[PDB]
Amino acid sequence: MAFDISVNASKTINALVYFSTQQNKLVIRNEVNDTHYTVEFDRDKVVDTFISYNRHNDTIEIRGVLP
Amino acid sequence: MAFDISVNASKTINALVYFSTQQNKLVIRNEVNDTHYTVEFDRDKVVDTFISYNRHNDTIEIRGVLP
Amino acid sequence: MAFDISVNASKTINALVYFSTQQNKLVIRNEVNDTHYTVEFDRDKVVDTFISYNRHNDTIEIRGVLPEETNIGCAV
Amino acid sequence: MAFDISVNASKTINALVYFSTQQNKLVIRNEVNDTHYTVEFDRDKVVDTFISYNRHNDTIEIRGVLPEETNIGCAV
Ligand SMILES: CCCCCCCCCCCCCC(=O)O
Ligand SMILES: CCCCCCCCCCCCCC(=O)O
């Protein structure tokens, strides 16, 4: 189980993280202008995320894995 | 385990689905211009996806869940 | 193997996706209005689709290309 | 509780996220260059962050706001 986001580095990623009691889920929401990408996980899952810059493609990347 | 994508409905979502032998993963890649959002799953997971239009916000939505 | 499907935008396209180790196939089961499509193709082959809203006829449209060796079932 | 962290863009920010049922807290463990931040806050509180590339000083920047009742640990 993994996810990956890549955006042009002129853009800003608005990342929100919370645990919702009503949903009983860990939420990671990523917004890039009018586009949103959300992933949701159970209350006891560990998500390891890596934020980086790719110089060759001029992109910001976020990769998430379940270790 | 769930994901959700929302994009302004003037945009087109390029969704690619494949199983990679080298990664041993089911891949769902969604590209919206220069932004990409990929989710990856194990070889025997079922992903139920729903593609819809939200008239109030003028957005295309894709929601995926593991049933 | 190009395809183009559409539904009125008040409705939802529902696609179930999985890789079946026993069939050794990627399987997509799609519900499109009153219609079911079962699509099966091989590992390391891609289904490449474009999902859009057609403002001219108020539809959700999916257009794309299937691998050469694809099996398709249709039922209503 | 505003924050602003940065690393040279040749490096990676590594954030581990989980909700600990026993502590009844959302926990984020971040590695930022030579530094570790442990951040803990309550359910139904949001950490709202903005991740960008700063072309002027070649850094990855994360700026954002933490909930009022947040615990922060820092180690090098
Ligand atoms: C998560 C997005 C999945 C997109 C699934 C697209 C597959 C649609 C196949 C429809 C094939 C219909 C063929 C026909 O028109 O007779
Ligand atoms: C998946 C994205 C997660 C983003 C995590 C942002 C949390 C960063 C907290 C850093 C707090 C540092 C406080 C300080 O500068 O002393």
Residue numbers in the entry:
A (entry chain B), B (entry chain B): 1 to 67
C (entry chain A), D (entry chain A): 1 to 76
Any passages from the paper?
The vaccinia virus protein A46 is one of a series of proteins preventing expression of host proteins that induce an anti-viral state. The VACV intracellular immunomodulators form a family of Bcl-2-like (B-cell lymphoma 2 like) proteins with low sequence identity but high structural similarity to the eukaryotic Bcl-2 protein family.
A46(1–83) crystallized with two molecules in the asymmetric unit; electron density for a bound ligand, later identified as myristic acid, was found inside one of the molecules. No electron density is seen for either residues 77–83 in subunit A or 67–83 in subunit B, suggesting that these regions may constitute a flexible linker between N- and C-terminal domains in the full-length molecule. A striking feature of the external β1-β7 face of the A subunit is a partially hydrophobic tunnel, spanning the whole subunit A and reaching into subunit B. In the X-ray structure of A46(1–83), clear electron density for C14:0 myristic acid was found, with the hydrophobic tail buried in the cavity whereas the carboxyl group is open to the solvent. Tyr37 adopts a dual conformation in the two subunits, suggesting a gate-keeper role as it folds back in subunit A to make room for the myristic acid. An acceptable alternative hypothesis would be that the bound fatty acids induce asymmetry of the A46(1–83) dimer, as they block a polymerization interface equivalent to B/B and prevent binding of a second fatty acid copy in subunit B. In such manner, using the same primary sequence, a dimer of heterodimers is formed that allows utilization of different interfaces for distinct functions such as tetramerization (interface B with 6 β-strands only) or binding of cellular targets (interface A with 7 β-strands).
